[PDB]
Amino acid sequence: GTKKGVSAAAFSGVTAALGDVGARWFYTWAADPQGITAPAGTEFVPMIWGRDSVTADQLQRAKAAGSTLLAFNEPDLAGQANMSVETALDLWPQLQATGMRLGAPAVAYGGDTPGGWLDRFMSGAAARGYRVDFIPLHWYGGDFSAAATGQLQSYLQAVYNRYHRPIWLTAYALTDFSGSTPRYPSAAEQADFVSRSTAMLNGLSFVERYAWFSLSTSTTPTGLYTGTTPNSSGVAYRAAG
Ligand SMILES: OC[C@H]1O[C@@H](O[C@@H]2[C@@H](O)[C@H](O[C@@H]3[C@@H](O)[C@H](O[C@@H]4[C@@H](O)[C@H](O[C@@H]5[C@@H](O)[C@@H](O)O[C@H](CO)[C@H]5O)O[C@H](CO)[C@H]4O)O[C@H](CO)[C@H]3O)O[C@H](CO)[C@H]2O)[C@H](O)[C@@H](O)[C@@H]1O
Ligand SMILES: OC[C@H]1O[C@@H](O)[C@H](O)[C@@H](O)[C@@H]1O
Ligand SMILES: [Zn+2]
């Protein structure tokens, strides 16, 4: 029951949307809920987004707003946190000193690749005697068939096997980023994938939490809700255990 969550930004109705979709948890890519009121029984998870998020005020805000902390967002990408492994490791003791359950930085891709961003982070954390409690991952599928759920699962299993930490899926959907602009599935293809993916993730015992990207169509064409109205994907996510 506890696995299903979502990423969110504020809007009139965001609270009722979080409640109605059945999110057990959420995050906002920031250290606090960014003005959002959590529904009863929905846990806020803070994030230290990037290098310049590592301050006394952000770390205090994070420890006051929740119990679990997510570290930097896609440091492997020039358009996101855009950090070396050395920079992430050098900042790590400040996140560790909060005492909160701590998630690895969330890499865009290649989490299972030897010599990749995550492999070098995990290996330096182990050499320095650091704590990494769990690994959050991002996945966007470019094959829009019933085969997509098996492909996402191969990726989560590859990362779980290499590092032996509980997995969170903090951002996923069907999106093909290989072309000049993003390519999306049909509404019926996206709804079917929501249904098959959540059933797979619910039974996959080393996955602790997952978060569809994202709650609102004002954030992304893969959104579940327009204002407080769910689309067929929103309906399929609400029905997931
Ligand atoms: O120094 C590195 C860069 O720092 C910037 O300054 C920081 C500033 O950006 C940051 O603000 C937060 C936003 O970055 C954050 O943005 C969210 C995205 O990261 C997220 O990205 C997803 C991605 O995770 C993946 O899933 O793929 C998705 C599809 O492509 C992609 O969208 O998307 C969400 C939804 O749109 C974004 O909201 O949002 C936070 C909440 O609003 C912001 O707080 O804050 C830090 C300080 O805390 C700043 O340092 C500079 O501007 C850059 O120039 C630097 O290179
Ligand atoms: O642009 C390329 C895309 O790569 C994906 O795998 C990342 O998660 C996105 O943040 C990014 O937009
Ligand atoms: Zn250093």
Residue of the CA atom closest to atom 49 of ligand 1: 52
Indicate which technique resolved this structure. X-ray
Helix (H, G, I), strand (E, B) or coil at 213: coil
Ligand 2 pocket, residue 21 CB under 6 Å: no
Ligand 2 pocket, residue 29 CB under 6 Å: no
Angle at 97 between CA 27 and CA 164, to 5 degrees: 65
Q: Tokens for 223? A: 């959104």
Angle at 136 between CA 134 and CA 140, to 5 degrees: 155
Q: Write down the residue that tokens 């109605």 correspond to.
A: 20
Q: Which residues surround ligand 3, an ion (CB under 5 A)?
A: 86, 90
Kindly identify the ligand whose nearest atom is closest to the C-alpha of 91: 3
Dist. CA 237–CA 231, nearest whole Å:
10
Q: At what angle do helices 232-239 and 187-203 cross, to 10 degrees?
A: 10
Q: What is the resolution of this structure in A?
A: 1.9
Dist. CA 122–CA 130, nearest whole Å:
9
Residue of the CA atom closest to atom 9 of ligand 2: 108
Kindly identify the ligand whose nearest atom is closest to the C-alpha of 218: 1
Q: Tokens for 43? A: 């846990």
Cis peptide bond N-terminal to 178, omega within 30: no
Cα 80 to averaged position of ligand 1 atoms, centre (Å) = 6
Ligand 1 pocket, residue 82 CB under 6 Å: yes
For a pocket test of ligand 1, which of 26, 27, 29 has the largest count of ligand atoms closer than 8 A to its C-beta?
29
- Distance set, CA 53 to CA 30, 36, 44, 46 (Å): 9, 20, 18, 12
Q: What is the DSSP string of 106-174?
A: BBSS-TTSTTSHHHHHHHHHHHTT----BEEEEEEES--STTHHHHHHHHHHHHHHHH---EEEEEEEE
Ligand 2 pocket, residue 109 CB under 6 Å: yes
Dist. CA 205–CA 122, nearest whole Å:
22
Closest-CA residue to 17 (of 6, 3, 28): 6
